[PDB]
């Protein structure tokens, strides 16, 4: 147990890894999953929320009491709301008015202010409004898809944690779903330096396969599929791409909750499905690692766990 800390943000990181036992068999490589939902705010985005705020503070771009703005309907909004409450900043989020009352409660519980944009305009409307508010009011905009502090934090924290966790082993493949691409890029850089023969694999939705050269399209893999190539994604880091369908990912998440006791979001199901595909190709005795970005409890009102 960690010694007492003065601020909840000091427990971000240091997340555990579990070996899968039942959804993959002994004829395939071993598959390990890093539980990023064990971060105190509930997802991998705790890491980047903290890093972007702390970098802007260290650079004098913001100081406690300042207001930040970000367009987000996902875990980055929760992460920034959480970190802003913990560090004494004011958070404003733009998002389409389709957001549920429970999610509004969650962000407002941390004291965030919401600016709702037209539902039919989806993310484009929220992004435009955030830029307008930044220019009108001077709010700081973290810019999760361009801010180098995002992949950098994974290079400094997530990746070196994996090196410590896998001392005495070599990792043969690391796979991660791409939202901003910061996890894949920062972890991938660290792991490729330590294990130069590793394969790095990007995961994206089959229904929106932009990294594969396809066009954006509607998809249900929460956390993935931004519809463009983020600046925070190093497109040279990955050796291959695995596309995952909406139904395949949901079926995997359900199996993993029931058969491993690991209750994770649909993007975690996509990651595990892809890791199992890779494990079958590499065979017994090899080591495959992936990241589970968020917990299934955050998605009980989606089809994911509706039986």
């Amino acid at each position: 147990a960690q010694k007492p800390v003065d601020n909840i943000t000091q427990i971000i990181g240091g997340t555990p890894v579990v070996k899968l036992r039942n959804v993959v068999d002994d004829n395939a490589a071993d598959v390990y999953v890093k539980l990023e939902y064990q971060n105190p705010g509930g997802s991998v985005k705790d890491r980047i929320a903290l890093a972007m705020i702390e970098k802007a503070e260290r650079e004098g771009k913001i100081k406690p009491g300042d207001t930040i703005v970000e367009p987000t309907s996902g875990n980055t909004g929760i992460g920034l709301a959480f970190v802003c409450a913990a560090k004494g900043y004011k958070a404003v989020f733009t998002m389409p008015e389709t957001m549920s009352q429970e999610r509004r409660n969650l962000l407002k519980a941390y004291g965030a202010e919401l600016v709702l944009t037209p539902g039919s305009e989806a993310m484009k409307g929220a992004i435009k409004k955030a830029k307008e508010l930044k220019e009108e009011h001077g709010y700081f905009e973290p810019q999760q898809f361009e801010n180098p502090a995002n992949p950098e934090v994974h290079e400094l924290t997530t990746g070196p944690e994996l090196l410590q966790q896998f001392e005495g082993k070599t990792i043969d493949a690391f796979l991660a779903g791409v939202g901003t691409g910061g996890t894949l890029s920062g972890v991938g850089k660290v792991l490729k330096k330590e294990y130069p023969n590793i394969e790095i694999v990007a995961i994206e939705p089959e229904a929106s396969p932009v990294l594969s050269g396809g066009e954006p399209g509607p998809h249900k893999l929460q956390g993935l599929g931004a519809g463009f190539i983020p600046g925070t994604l190093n497109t040279e880091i990955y050796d291959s791409i695995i596309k995952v369908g909406n139904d395949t990912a949901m079926e995997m998440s359900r199996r993993v909750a029931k058969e491993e006791g690991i209750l994770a979001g649909i993007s975690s199901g996509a990651a595990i499905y892809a890791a199992i595909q890779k494990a079958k190709e590499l065979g017994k005795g090899k080591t495959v690692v992936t990241v589970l970005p968020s917990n299934g409890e955050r998605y009980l009102s989606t089809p994911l766990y509706s039986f």
Binding site: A122, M123, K124, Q144, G179, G223, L224, A226
Partner: peptide, 6 residues
């Protein structure tokens, strides 16, 4: 109209 949750 494109939506993502990031």
């Amino acid at each position: 109209g494109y939506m993502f949750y990031i």
